[PDB]
Structures are given as C-alpha cells and as structure tokens.
Amino acid sequence: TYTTGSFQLILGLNAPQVISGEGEPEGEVFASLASLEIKPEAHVQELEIRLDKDTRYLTQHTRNLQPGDTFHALVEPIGEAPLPRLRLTDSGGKPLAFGLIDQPGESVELNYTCDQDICELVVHVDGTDGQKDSGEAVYRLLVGINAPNLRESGQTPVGSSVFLESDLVTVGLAVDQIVGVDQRSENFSVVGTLKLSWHDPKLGFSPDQCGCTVKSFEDASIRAVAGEINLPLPSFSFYNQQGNRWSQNQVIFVTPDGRASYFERFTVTLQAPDFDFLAYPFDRQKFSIKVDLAVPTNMFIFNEIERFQQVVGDQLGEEEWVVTSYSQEITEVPFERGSTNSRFTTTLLVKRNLEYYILRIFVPLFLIISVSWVIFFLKDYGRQLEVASGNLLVFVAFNFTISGDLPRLGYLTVLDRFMIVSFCLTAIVVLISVCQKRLGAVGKQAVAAQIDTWVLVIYPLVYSLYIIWVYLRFFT
C-alpha cells in the first residue's frame, strides 16, 4: 500500500553536510515550489438538506484553508420553498461574510478569501424567519474551495469533501447468559461481550521508533486512554446501568495505519421499568440493552453492525427464561447541550416455562376442586360435611405449600384471583353442607336432594364462565 503523513525536506547545493540530515539554512535560495506556477486545484461538493419544523437551523464545518485560498457557496431550492438566509462565520462565531440575493432571485451566493495562517470556517443556513410550520422544505447546497465556476461546474464533484465527515464506528454485542431477574425492583442481570472498531489516522505511528506492529493498552477504559493520549476517542456507557460494572479482558490495540478496536467482557445489571407482570405466569417480557456514545454525532457515529458470534448463546441444561426472538438496531437520541448521540439497542423476547407451572399448580388444584364437587352424590350429609371441612383445610395446606411460587408484588395477578375464587367456592360448599344437614334434620330430604342436583349442575359452569371471563379480560 501507499503511506500518508507529514514530512520535512532539506535540499542542498554543493553542501556535503546535507546528507547528515542536520544542514542549517544558509546562502541564497535556489529552488521553489512547482505548483505555484499554475492555477491551484479545485474541490467541489454538493449536498441535499431539509429544514424540518424543529430543525430550521443547520451548520456545517469546513476543513482548514491555507492563506490565499478562496471559498464559494450557493443555495437553490428544490421547488417552491422560500429562499433561506446564508452566512459564514469562524469556529468562534465571528461573522465573516453574508449571502447576497442575485437579480434572478432564485439563489443566494457567498464569497470569501483567506488571510490568516489557518482559517476554520462554518457555514450557517437557517430558515427561521418567523414561526411558520411550512413542513418539508428541501434545498440543494453547492460549495467549493478554489472553485469560482460553481455556477456552471459541469464536472461531477471532484477532489475531496469540503465539509468534514464523522468517524464511522462498527459495533457488535453478544449475550451469553441471563443470570437473574428481580421482579420487585424491576431489574435484570446479563453476561456478554462487547466489541468496537474504528479507523483514525491520527492514532497511527511509525514502526521504526518501536520495532513493532501492534501497540496495545490494557485494563483501562476508553476515557482514561483518551485522557492519557490527548486524543478524542469514542467513549460509551450503558444507559440503564445500576451500580458498578464488572469487566474482564479489557484491551485497546492499534495498528500503524490507524485501525483501532476495543474488546470487553462484562457482567452488568440493568433497570427495566417497562416490566408488566399482570398476566403472570403467562406474561411475556422484553429485555432491552442500550449502548449510547458519549460524544456528539458530528464526531463519531455508529455505521454498521457486526455479528462476530451468535447474539444469543446456547448453554447446557434448561433455563427459566426462553428466548423466542431478538433484534438489533441503530438509532439517534437527543443529547445534552443539543446535537445528537448514537444508540445501539439489543432486544430479547422471553417467556416462562409453562409446563412447570401447569403441572406443579393447576392439576392438584383441579383434583382438590373435584374432591369438593364429588361429595354431593352422598345422601348421608354428616359425611359430606366432614369431608368438606377436611377438604377446606387440605386446600389451605396446598395453597401455603405452593406459596413459594407466588410473587409478592403488591398487586393482583391471575393466579391470586383464581386461588381466591377457588377458596371462596370451597367455603360456600361447607356452608351449603351445613344447610343441607339442618334441612335433613328437620325432615325435608327432598329439598336437600334438589339442592344437591342444583350444585352439581351449577359449579363446573361457574368455573368455566370465570375462566372465559379471565381470558377475555386479560388475553384479548
């Protein structure tokens, strides 16, 4: 490949000390720059911009200009959009030029020339004349350096970009194991791996001063390395991190071309305010992992997603939570002190193990309810009363035996409501048994038999109607 960088050149004429590399300037000059003999090279760039209702002000940064250079800019609307205002300022905001409306008033033009040793220019395009919400006005912006022919360029954009571009960062994340879910405080913990990669020529170095191909930094965060080497680096954080984060194998290494990458193995706890356990245990939850860059989008921005490993890893044995699907996306979110920062989000859809709850809870409850129902075939009401009294205690014993699988959230779930209804019906069975015993005692066995038939007909219908109502009110 080729190479890039700055250089120092020493030329001598009949001065044998030059080959030592230490020749100090002397005598009268004899050579000069060749490029000064002709007209300088031009760079032209064109961009399309849109001024939304809340984005009526836009600014762009230009590369450094050497003394003697010239700067031109022009703006022309795509359609019937009104002509916006244009002006040029330095990096501090000191005004330098203002746009002029041409006699064919369909465009605004600007011009400037460089005087200082180094000039940094910023172009302002704004349409905040008033407060009208025009909508989707769109304009075409043409800008060039040493290009006085921007009116009729003819050629496609040549040279290099006039405006600075943001550094592109490739990110990737993998989840290894879900290590816990807290249902009262609404947070969960996860173990996984994170990887970042970006290219920056300012970090490149020359091998001949170290005799190596790889330079690495270990056991330090990106912020610490950036503060040590006095260069901007793409720092990040977890948006919903709770407490400190444990990290392993944290390393940053760079190549002489300037390609750098970051690696980390983490165990973190994340807050999840969106949890909803109303449909417990048939609830479905979303595990979202958010990674936000701590720099404005004009410096660094996520560009691509890398799948270095499987996003969700397989492990031996069964799990409490089963992942159904996953997704990854890159978006933009508002940032402090204006501007915008990049966000990388990984979402997991999970559900519980249904067979566990079904076999452990519902079948024994059904059997207890059946025991309470079957006793109405007997015509000896003392035995019926005794068995009902025993079955109520059996129901309470089973309820407190399974109490370990009953979350205490401060609000009702489906299981709690079902248990309450079953307990109420079981107690009503004992009440009806007492009433039938008294009726048989007074000599009205026919009424007791009729009540038995009525209960036998009614109870399963009531249970089925309650189940249908719960399904209607919680699952559709």
Ligand X SMILES: CCCCCCCCCCCCCC
Tell me the two tokens of residue 205. 């170095």
Q: Report in angstroms the alpha-carbon separations of 144 from 91, 95, 121, 166, 212.
A: 18, 19, 12, 19, 41
Per-residue three-class SS string for 258-271: CEEEEEEEEEEEEE
Instruction: Please provide residue 233's backbone torsions phi and psi, each rounded to the nearest 5 degrees.
Output: -130, 155
- The residue type at 108: V
Q: Are 226 and 207 in contact (CB under 8 A)?
A: no
* Residue placing its CB nearer to ligand CCCCCCCCCC in the complex, 148 or 460: 460
The burial of 133, by beta-carbon neighbours within 10 Å (0-12 exposed, 13-18 middle, 19 or more buried), is given as exposed
Provide the minimum distance between the beta carbon of 417 and ligand CCCCCCCCCC in the complex, in angstroms, as a whole number. Answer: 7
Going by their DSSP bridges, the two strands 215-218 and 246-254 should be labelled as: antiparallel
| CA distance linking residue 175 with residue 348, whole number of Å | 10
Annotated binding site for Ca(2+): 186, 273, 275, 316, 318-319
Provide the minimum distance between the beta carbon of 364 and a second copy in the complex, in angstroms, as a whole number. Answer: 6
Binder of residue 320, out of ligand CCCCCCCCCC, ligand X, a second copy, none (CB less than 5 to 8 A by kind):
a second copy
Give the angle 298-303-305 at the CA atoms, nearest 5°.
150
Counting contacts by CB under 8 A, is residue 459 touching a second copy?
A: no
Task: Name 307's bridge partners.
Answer: none
Q: Are 274 and 286 in contact (CB under 8 A)?
A: yes
Out of 367, 427, 456, 468, the residue judged to bind ligand X by CB under 6 A? 456
Binder of residue 467, out of ligand CCCCCCCC, a second copy, ligand CCCCCCCCCC, none (CB less than 5 to 8 A by kind):
ligand CCCCCCCCCC
| CA distance linking residue 200 with residue 178, whole number of Å | 35
- E-strand ranges in 335-424 read 340-351
* Residue placing its CB nearer to ligand CCCCCCCC in the complex, 393 or 465: 465
Counting contacts by CB under 6 A, is residue 418 touching ligand X?
A: no
Restricting to residues 293-322, which ones interact with a second copy according to CB under 8 A? 315-321
Provide the minimum distance between the beta carbon of 281 and ligand X in the complex, in angstroms, as a whole number. Answer: 22
Counting contacts by CB under 8 A, is residue 356 touching a second copy?
A: yes
Binder of residue 135, out of a second copy, ligand CCCCCCCC, ligand X, none (CB less than 5 to 8 A by kind):
none
| CA distance linking residue 90 with residue 103, whole number of Å | 28
Restricting to residues 452-471, which ones interact with ligand CCCCCCCCCC according to CB under 6 A? 460, 463-464, 467, 470-471
* Residue placing its CB nearer to a second copy in the complex, 144 or 172: 172
Binding site for ligand CCCCCCCC (CB under 6 A): 353-355, 358-359, 362-363, 366, 417, 420-421, 424-425
Question: What is the DSSP secondary structure assignment for residue 458, as one 8-state letter?
Answer: H
* Residue placing its CB nearer to a second copy in the complex, 139 or 395: 395
* Residue placing its CB nearer to ligand X in the complex, 158 or 431: 431
Counting contacts by CB under 8 A, is residue 11 touching a second copy?
A: no
- List for the chain the helix, strand, coil content (%; round to 5): 30, 35, 40
Counting contacts by CB under 8 A, is residue 267 touching a second copy?
A: yes
Sheet with strand 121-126: strands edge to edge: 57-61, 121-126, 85-90, 95-98
Binding mask 411-450 for ligand CCCCCCCCCC (x = CB under 6 A): ---xx--x------------x---x--x------------
Going by their DSSP bridges, the two strands 300-305 and 167-182 should be labelled as: parallel
Provide the minimum distance between the beta carbon of 184 and ligand CCCCCCCCCC in the complex, in angstroms, as a whole number. Answer: 22
Counting contacts by CB under 6 A, is residue 453 touching ligand X?
A: yes
Task: Name 97's bridge partners.
Answer: 88
* Residue placing its CB nearer to ligand X in the complex, 327 or 370: 370
Question: Looking at the chain, how many residues does it have?
Answer: 476
Counting contacts by CB under 6 A, is residue 459 touching ligand X?
A: yes
Handedness of CA 403, 405, 411, 412 (dihedral sign): negative
Provide the minimum distance between the beta carbon of 427 and ligand X in the complex, in angstroms, as a whole number. Answer: 12
- The residue type at 387: V
Counting contacts by CB under 8 A, is residue 390 touching a second copy?
A: yes
Restricting to residues 244-283, which ones interact with ligand CCCCCCCCCC according to CB under 6 A? 282
The burial of 431, by beta-carbon neighbours within 10 Å (0-12 exposed, 13-18 middle, 19 or more buried), is given as exposed
- E-strand ranges in 38-157 read 43-51, 57-61, 70-77, 85-90, 95-98, 100-101, 108-113, 121-126, 137-145
Q: Which stretch binds a second copy (CB under 8 A): 42-50, 63-71, 105-113, 239-247?
A: 239-247
Provide the minimum distance between the beta carbon of 239 and ligand X in the complex, in angstroms, as a whole number. Answer: 51
Binder of residue 282, out of ligand X, ligand CCCCCCCCCC, ligand CCCCCCCC, none (CB less than 5 to 8 A by kind):
ligand CCCCCCCCCC
Binder of residue 337, out of ligand X, a second copy, ligand CCCCCCCCCC, none (CB less than 5 to 8 A by kind):
a second copy
* Residue placing its CB nearer to ligand CCCCCCCCCC in the complex, 238 or 282: 282
Binder of residue 358, out of ligand CCCCCCCC, a second copy, ligand X, none (CB less than 5 to 8 A by kind):
ligand CCCCCCCC
- The residue type at 459: Y
| CA distance linking residue 162 with residue 180, whole number of Å | 51
Provide the minimum distance between the beta carbon of 183 and ligand X in the complex, in angstroms, as a whole number. Answer: 32
